[PDB]
């Protein structure tokens, strides 16, 4: 089984620099980087067999260690338009997970996590006033995945807010504990917020 694992990424201000990478498991292989944003869709940027999209020539350097099966993309002097989710893509069959890259004058800000309490009961968590995306939300460390809705974050006044709802039988809350687990890696935040009845 071929697997493409990628990492690095994060936030920098315009002008900043970042090296991302991925490793293939499972010599004979071309590797490319494709970035995704809502405003430009999927955009191929660079490939090593090196070739670079016109928009990032002189800013990006794609490279590989054939030993380690570990290809890198060095992203120097980054621009706000370089913001997006970057995929390792082995043309044409395999994609990585995607690492987020944010270039913005706005600085890292951790979330405030707030519990939302009132047959079936709905509860939720409010993850407010953070930067940059992403945060991840879990309920009871994964035990509740069915009946969870985590909404897309929305940027307002240079901070993101998201919310998540979970619906469970009334016979399971508050008699049993319900907890939203929130992580925001950019700020080394991890919180486990109990939903207590009011």
């Amino acid at each position: 089984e071929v697997k493409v694992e990628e990492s690095g990424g994060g936030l920098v201000q315009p002008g900043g620099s970042m090296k991302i990478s991925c490793v293939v498991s499972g010599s004979n292989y071309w590797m490319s980087w494709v970035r995704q944003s809502p405003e430009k869709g999927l955009e191929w940027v660079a490939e090593i067999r090196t070739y670079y999209a016109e928009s990032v020539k002189g800013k990006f350097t794609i490279s590989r260690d054939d030993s380690k099966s570990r290809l890198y993309l060095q992203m120097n002097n980054l621009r706000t338009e370089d913001t997006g989710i970057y995929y390792c893509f082995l043309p044409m069959d395999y994609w990585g997970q995607g690492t987020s890259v944010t270039v913005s004058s706005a600085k890292t800000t951790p979330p405030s996590v707030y519990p939302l309490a009132p047959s079936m009961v709905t509860l939720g968590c409010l993850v407010k006033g953070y930067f940059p995306e992403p945060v991840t939300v879990t309920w009871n460390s994964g035990s509740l995945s069915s009946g969870v809705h985590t909404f897309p974050a929305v940027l307002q006044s240079d901070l993101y807010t998201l919310s998540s709802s979970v619906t469970v039988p009334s016979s399971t809350w508050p008699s049993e504990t319900v907890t939203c687990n929130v992580a925001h890696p950019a700020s080394s935040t991890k919180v486990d917020k109990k939903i207590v009845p009011r």
């Binding site: 490939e47 043309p91 995607g98 405030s112 709905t122 909404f151």
Partner: protein, 218 residues
């Protein structure tokens, strides 16, 4: 460089019925070897793209047999027979006949199902948030179909437009429904000076708005 054109939204499709997604290339992808270098990817909600079809008509490993594709060198159609709720996602066409490699804009496969009224829930500010000095009222309108929905907030019966933050999910992969979150944020000082907060949801499944409210005095 090659422009790959697809529409943003498919014709909607009932479960168990057949779907099609069109794509056009600006340059022909059919070569002298008789092979057309066209590829299809699905990007399921939350996930990366995954390969469905290679060389126009070949089914990728582990892809359901209900998917198929065919076309000329410039016009292609991905077809999905007996559509399942898990087929929901964004489908991309792509070529590999030159650099830059380019993709279509992605076509969202739109599943059509039975109507469903939203489950509405409202929540006052937590003691935690109130200690920070802010006060958010939240309304979830969950698992509804069709996707269009309107939410209005009242404070003490008067409509409040400012301080409202709305978000929408994509079509759910399991039940084919949609959900919305609406948050009204205020300061603790304003919050403690009004008594009733109301979220009202108009959806085609009821001529009357569904309304949830709470009153800080009970």
């Amino acid at each position: 460089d090659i422009v790959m054109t697809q529409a943003a939204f498919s014709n909607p499709v009932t479960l168990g019925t057949s779907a099609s997604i069109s794509c056009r290339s600006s340059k022909s992808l059919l070569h002298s070897d008789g092979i057309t270098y066209l590829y299809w990817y699905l990007q399921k909600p939350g996930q990366s793209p995954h390969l469905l079809i290679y060389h126009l008509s070949n089914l990728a490993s582990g892809v359901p047999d209900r998917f198929s594709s065919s076309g000329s060198g410039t016009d292609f159609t991905l077809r999905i027979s007996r559509v399942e709720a898990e087929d929901v996602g964004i489908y991309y066409c792509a070529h590999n006949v030159e650099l830059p490699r380019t993709f279509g804009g992605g076509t969202k496969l739109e599943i059509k199902r039975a109507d469903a009224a939203p489950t509405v829930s409202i929540f006052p500010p937590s003691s935690e948030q109130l200690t920070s000095g802010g006060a958010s009222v939240v309304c979830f309108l969950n698992n509804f179909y069709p996707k269009d929905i309107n939410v209005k907030w009242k404070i003490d019966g008067s409509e409040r437009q400012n301080g409202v933050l709305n978000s929408w999910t994509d079509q759910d992969s399991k039940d084919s429904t949609y959900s919305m979150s609406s948050t009204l944020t205020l300061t603790k000082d304003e919050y403690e000076r009004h008594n009733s907060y109301t979220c009202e949801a108009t959806h085609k499944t009821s001529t009357s708005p569904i309304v949830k409210s709470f009153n800080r005095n009970e």
